[PDB]
Design an enzyme around this catalytic site. Sequence first.
Site, mmCIF file in Angstrom:
data_model
loop_
_atom_site.group_PDB
_atom_site.id
_atom_site.type_symbol
_atom_site.label_atom_id
_atom_site.label_comp_id
_atom_site.label_asym_id
_atom_site.label_seq_id
_atom_site.Cartn_x
_atom_site.Cartn_y
_atom_site.Cartn_z
ATOM 1 N NE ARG A 125 -1.178 12.120 5.566
ATOM 2 C CZ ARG A 125 -1.839 10.969 5.462
ATOM 3 N NH1 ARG A 125 -1.360 9.888 6.052
ATOM 4 N NH2 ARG A 125 -2.931 10.863 4.691
ATOM 5 N NE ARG A 173 -4.726 3.966 -3.405
ATOM 6 C CZ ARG A 173 -4.611 3.529 -2.135
ATOM 7 N NH1 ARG A 173 -4.871 4.362 -1.088
ATOM 8 N NH2 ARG A 173 -4.248 2.262 -1.881
ATOM 9 C CD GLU A 175 -6.182 10.447 6.380
ATOM 10 O OE1 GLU A 175 -7.289 10.398 5.808
ATOM 11 O OE2 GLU A 175 -5.567 9.429 6.801
ATOM 12 C CG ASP A 179 -2.096 1.017 1.066
ATOM 13 O OD1 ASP A 179 -2.283 1.617 -0.020
ATOM 14 O OD2 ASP A 179 -2.830 1.228 2.092
ATOM 15 C CG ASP A 181 -2.317 6.562 7.527
ATOM 16 O OD1 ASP A 181 -2.638 7.177 6.489
ATOM 17 O OD2 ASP A 181 -2.524 5.337 7.673
#
Lengths: 651, 651
Positions: B287, B525, B331, B142, B289
Amino acid sequence: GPLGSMLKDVLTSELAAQVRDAFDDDRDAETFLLRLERYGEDLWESLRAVYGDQVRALPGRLLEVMLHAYHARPAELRRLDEARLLRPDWLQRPEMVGYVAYTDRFAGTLKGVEERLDYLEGLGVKYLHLMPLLRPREGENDGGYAVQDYRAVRPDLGTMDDLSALARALRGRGISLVLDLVLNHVAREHAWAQKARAGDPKYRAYFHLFPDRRGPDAFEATLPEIFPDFAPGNFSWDEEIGEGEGGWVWTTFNSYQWDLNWANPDVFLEFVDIILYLANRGVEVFRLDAIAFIWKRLGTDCQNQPEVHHLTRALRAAARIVAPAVAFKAEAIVAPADLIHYLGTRAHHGKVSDMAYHNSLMVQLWSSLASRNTRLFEEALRAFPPKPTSTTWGLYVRCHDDIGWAISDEDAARAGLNGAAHRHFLSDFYSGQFPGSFARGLVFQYNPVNGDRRISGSAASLAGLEAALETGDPGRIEDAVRRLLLLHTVILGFGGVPLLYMGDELALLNDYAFEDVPEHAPDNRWVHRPQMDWALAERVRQEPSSPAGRVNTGLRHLLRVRRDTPQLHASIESQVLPSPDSRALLLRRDHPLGGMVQVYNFSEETVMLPSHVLRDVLGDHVQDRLSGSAFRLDRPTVRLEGYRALWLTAG
Amino acid sequence: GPLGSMLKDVLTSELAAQVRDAFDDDRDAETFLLRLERYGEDLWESLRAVYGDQVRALPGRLLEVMLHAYHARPAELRRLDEARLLRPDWLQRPEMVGYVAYTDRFAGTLKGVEERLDYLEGLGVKYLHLMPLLRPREGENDGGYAVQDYRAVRPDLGTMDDLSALARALRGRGISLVLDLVLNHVAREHAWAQKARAGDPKYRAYFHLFPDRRGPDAFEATLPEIFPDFAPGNFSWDEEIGEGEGGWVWTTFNSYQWDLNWANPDVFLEFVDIILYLANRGVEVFRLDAIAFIWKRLGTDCQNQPEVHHLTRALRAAARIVAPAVAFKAEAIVAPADLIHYLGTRAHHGKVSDMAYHNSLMVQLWSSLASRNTRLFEEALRAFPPKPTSTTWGLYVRCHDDIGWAISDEDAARAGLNGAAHRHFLSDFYSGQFPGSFARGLVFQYNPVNGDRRISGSAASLAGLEAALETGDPGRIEDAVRRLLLLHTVILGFGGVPLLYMGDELALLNDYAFEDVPEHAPDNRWVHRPQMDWALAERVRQEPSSPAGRVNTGLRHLLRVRRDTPQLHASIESQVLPSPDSRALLLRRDHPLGGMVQVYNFSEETVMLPSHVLRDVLGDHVQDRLSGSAFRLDRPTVRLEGYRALWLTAG
């Protein structure tokens, strides 16, 4: 270019070397250096804006004062510095509440103050401004504002060690000590002034001295008169100036207050030293007294010149490099767009001050109490630019000074009023000359040349209590109590630190005995500077149903609600919500957890306020934080009895 | 009462003793203690909100991790901590500009990044988010978000020492290193998961494991499907779970990402340790996630539960007690009123995170580009409560993920739209299925059960460049370049850190070669995760008139104006000024030095905007910061050619 850049580099690295040389402990050096990097550009650019290349000789001397102050700062205050860096919004919290008092009028001496901390703490006080307590001239001294020695406490209050010991006891209760920095002028008896008179040219240069009337007359052409009844004009004749006959000295205020010459960097150095000295005795916030006055310029009113903000920023930066806990609070009576420059401009330059007095809110409170009309209030607030979100207003109902009607002609015109007419009405109303007025104030400094009047009087005397108690009429008493609670509700809700004036919580009335003290009798501001009434304080505790006890109880309840209302964080400003009825003022405060509308009836009349204005903001169901109760806003009207305040949120 | 109070006292004084015991240098002890006093109530109350009395056994263990991390923190990072305490609004300055890249796609390795600092600095970049660079599982991972070891850098990028060395070179250029904390799930190959499978009960308890379908089916009743084409549902079967046949494991995302069990405090301790370890290698912003996912609750969608904010606040408080420089960036894809809770609530509790992604601005940008209508944009922005003024949005045009059309039915209805119809239009438009669309995107995760679609595609491919260059039509090319500059103008002006996506400054198009990499081919993506094109970067430098060079030049000019516009300080939020023409969006920003109105044409058409809407805010004479030029606002109209942006102030 390269030549300019090279010089700058050599200076930066010379400053760095002086700092590293000054510390045996490297962590200390590195900390000092990190602060100089944070504040240095503010500091030095501000200095070169005011002083040009003279400044280039200055870092050396300035760093000496700061390095030593840093070495001298008690570990307990360095810990305070760290604590304030960790909580930068400390002044903006709803739990912040101020109290303002003359040391001797409140509790006799500095040690006396220690004995009343339970009183201050039981009011939720966390910020204590003690009125000028540095040694003043003997006799008349403008209530302490004619300072003879900044390094000594007035001997009857105690010593610098009692002041330091007081600041420690205050910190144990979560209270910050706040003092005046009287930086515009000194007493004529201060050693600087004595040596200027004896002929020392270093100290003659600390003042604005003139051999005859040519300079004085030239300045006077564009200067207002602050105290026409005490000291005409802005210059005083002193026989002992010079070797010959005397000379003229700039004296904006009383003749015995000599304005300092801030075009001289020595004066800047002296005040850096005074500030750092008092910070090291535990002073946390400095009120910059008469800050708008410190820069003179021929052809202008000598108020609010650009140099004032440069000097204020530099004094602040010098102080906080050493003592990050210290904050500054500007006192400045100027148009709103200008006042914002006493805080900062959120641009390329650093912050100028942490707090400023919101003089306009205070004037509008009293103005709308008299007119029972809020439209002027709306327009006066609407004139303000926003402040930097990290700065905080100081709000007040009354203070040690008279009230000046600072109402702008433009604001007034937008509310359908003539500004001069309305200012004239307010002094007739508050002096009790207007028929039916509830106010018992005194005219201060009537100026026959232009008609200007200010007003002295205690909150409770101006708001109708003194008159109501003479009549005995229960309706006049109730309205006066309601007006006093309304005034305090606004300052507690507006956003900023509310500065309670000593004794207003007991509704103290005018003290007409000031006339019997020869040093006070010429100055009717002493009418609203009473001695604390501890017997009354104990009666209201045991019998709260008297008019004084209902003010006291009501105010203590308002203080508790303020502390528990997160919408009051001072980072958020109150905005006008235009009212459909000119007897009511509506203030809106947005907040992450939901908006608040504060609703205020400035009339004794029952107002049936149309519900739609509130429903549109908050929806159908609201609660009042002040009374706990509810309103459905889908009904046509909300009933506000005389002087009702509501703090509405959704629910 | 007394019993409760006594226990609390014994705990406080036990925490104090452990801290004092841990330092030989008293200043260190006192600093640690001052931070624990600032953050401790947040920390501990947050912990007892999530974990109840289990927490009482926790301070000991938690303080151990923090004390050691504090001892291990390099003097240079303790200096960074002090620097950030001195500049608490550092993220809110207009000069802040972000850049987001995969280390290897940008520059091959961490040392490779050091070699491109002049590139980042020449763009005025001061915040660098490097995509997940901790060692992932082999094969499909991923794009790094399946982490196998949080204590190792993926070996081809370098080592933890190169990461530390990179962070030091970045600080030399005034750039903050920003990394993902992938805290919701680990790779199935992570040692915790390997031991859970081997039967260790400590590590089985780090996951959500089930012996059969009874639990899984019960949860699935109320869970959405994030990746229906990769890993149906939210549970995966693993043969090696247990001693017998396998078992079910919660896998919100891909089957090889195992959701961690945040009801276990051991998981909280592990992440405190990971955060502090990476902070000590120079990481400044984390960040968080998938933060909305970390708390599961039967009967709910397992997103945005209250515990998420408690855990986030506690992780933040633990980190900043040790390392005040570190900030957090949530996020979270949630309704606006909810997103504000990922920042803080300006109430009785501490701040939850320093930054959050403004997903709604990004969605509305693309939505209005397609519809040429801004009314939905106005209503979506109007739905936001205000944020705490000390918190800062992260703004973006594109990023590594697909675009989800997070448009609320209520917002849509207020703009006269049906929400479901409009979301359906946006995926038809951006997949190129709608006739005349300029967009070349790809459908991502079509869900046959409910029709949901997201969109992949690079900014330049979605905004019309790829289609325009195929046709060769100069008008289609010009409009696509104008659309790309418009999107970036909005994120640069909106207030917050604009997060430039690697390569958008060169207008990189879809990379269809992702299909040729077997590990990438199932996940489109990768189409908008190109390798950096350095040959193109050098062509635009030497030939800026190509479509890529006009995007590049235009963006560099916008970056310079942003840096010099003090109205963009992020403490101030943009407000909607309702537009009289549905092709234009007007945003108002109040500021101490005067208001700004930003004017944006979301149409290719020439808009004659009625002047009164702007004049009412700014008066008769304005200047455009973007072009330098002027407008008299007393004329009937202001001419906006297709895609014109203006940043107007008075003058």
